[PDB]
Design an enzyme around this catalytic site. Structure first.
Site, mmCIF file in Angstrom:
data_model
loop_
_atom_site.group_PDB
_atom_site.id
_atom_site.type_symbol
_atom_site.label_atom_id
_atom_site.label_comp_id
_atom_site.label_asym_id
_atom_site.label_seq_id
_atom_site.Cartn_x
_atom_site.Cartn_y
_atom_site.Cartn_z
ATOM 1 N N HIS A 288 -5.482 -6.879 4.881
ATOM 2 C CA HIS A 288 -4.767 -5.819 4.182
ATOM 3 C C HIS A 288 -3.327 -6.191 3.846
ATOM 4 O O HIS A 288 -2.738 -5.585 2.943
ATOM 5 C CB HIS A 288 -4.800 -4.537 5.021
ATOM 6 C CG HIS A 288 -4.208 -3.348 4.336
ATOM 7 N ND1 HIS A 288 -4.641 -2.913 3.103
ATOM 8 C CD2 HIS A 288 -3.235 -2.487 4.721
ATOM 9 C CE1 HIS A 288 -3.949 -1.844 2.747
ATOM 10 N NE2 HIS A 288 -3.083 -1.569 3.708
ATOM 11 N N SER B 194 0.759 -1.252 0.000
ATOM 12 C CA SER B 194 0.000 0.000 0.000
ATOM 13 C C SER B 194 0.791 1.304 0.000
ATOM 14 O O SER B 194 1.076 1.849 -1.068
ATOM 15 C CB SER B 194 -1.039 0.036 1.113
ATOM 16 O OG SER B 194 -1.846 1.190 0.931
ATOM 17 N N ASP C 285 -10.799 -6.540 2.262
ATOM 18 C CA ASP C 285 -9.767 -5.753 2.919
ATOM 19 C C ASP C 285 -10.467 -4.537 3.503
ATOM 20 O O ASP C 285 -11.002 -3.716 2.752
ATOM 21 C CB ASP C 285 -8.721 -5.326 1.882
ATOM 22 C CG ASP C 285 -7.588 -4.497 2.468
ATOM 23 O OD1 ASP C 285 -7.693 -4.017 3.617
ATOM 24 O OD2 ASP C 285 -6.577 -4.318 1.760
#
Length: 268
Positions: free
Chosen positions: A244, A93, A215
């Site tokens: 995640h 991310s 997620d």
């Protein structure tokens, strides 16, 4: 040396370099199960982003790291120090978005971006669903400092989609609570307030978007939003995983997917 400050490690060999960028709360050790499948085919550069618990608190600039751009510019400097260009950047991310921004300024440094659980913005607007409402986020962050450990522990099982007693949870908490508390809180507030949507149309390097099907930090529609709004080509693969950090919690599913996107280009 900026490489030393980021604990850069180099392994493998090959004409193509893979750069592994860990996400929030982890360090380069998160890649330990992926590395054996790269070492024979690629040179691999691993680093810790500034503020990871493995880094020197004296180097953490609270002004620069209150937005993601500082991480983007650090990454460029790391790649330059090690003479890396046209790399395959694999990030989780926060890190994959920092590389996307970096690639606007230095597309010569990136052959493609492989992005695990990316999102350009967490906070909802009238037209965009990121998963979190501004006013609730505001309440939670007001008492973040005194509650960092209890809030992080309380939410981590849903964040990771893993039991509190699991090996993945113990590993995540080990690195998460290795950050100095004021640094952890600064990075947390930075992530919660990010809005990288204005950059997306100017990213042109190919992007490989790898998501969990469930997620809590990334609504499934965010992947398609990225595909529609990035300025270059992209591929979206939703995996039969939850959590995640599926590279940490479900490596048996996630590692083969990541490897496919590293090894297979979508452009000529």
């Amino acid at each position: 040396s900026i490489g030393l400050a980021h604990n850069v490690t180099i392994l493998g060999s090959g004409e193509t370099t893979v750069v592994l960028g860990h996400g929030y709360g982890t360090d380069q050790s998160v890649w330990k199960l992926l590395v054996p499948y790269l070492v024979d085919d690629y040179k691999v550069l691993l680093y810790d982003h500034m503020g990871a618990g493995t880094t020197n608190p004296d180097y953490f600039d609270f002004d620069r790291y209150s937005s993601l751009e500082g991480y983007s510019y650090d990454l460029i400097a790391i790649l330059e120090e090690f003479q890396v260009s046209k790399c395959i950047y694999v990030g989780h991310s926060m890190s994959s978005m920092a590389a996307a921004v970096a690639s606007i300024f230095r597309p010569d440094l990136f052959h493609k971006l492989v992005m695990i659980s990316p999102t350009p913005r967490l906070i909802n607007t009238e037209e965009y669903y990121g998963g979190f409402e501004q006013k609730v986020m505001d309440e939670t962050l007001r008492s973040l400092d005194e509650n960092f450990k209890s809030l992080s522990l309380g939410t981590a099982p849903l964040l990771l989609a893993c039991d509190l007693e699991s090996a993945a949870m113990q590993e995540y908490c080990r690195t998460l609570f290795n950050m100095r508390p004021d640094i952890a809180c600064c990075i947390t507030r930075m992530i919660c307030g990010l809005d990288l949507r204005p950059y997306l149309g100017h990213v042109t390097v190919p992007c490989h978007i790898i998501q969990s099907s469930n997620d809590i930090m990334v609504p499934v529609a965010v992947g398609e939003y990225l595909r529609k709004n990035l300025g270059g080509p992209s591929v979206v693969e939703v995996m039969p995983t939850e959590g995640h950090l599926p590279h940490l919690s479900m490596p048996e599913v996630t590692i083969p997917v990541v490897l496919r996107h590293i090894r297979q280009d979508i452009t000529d």
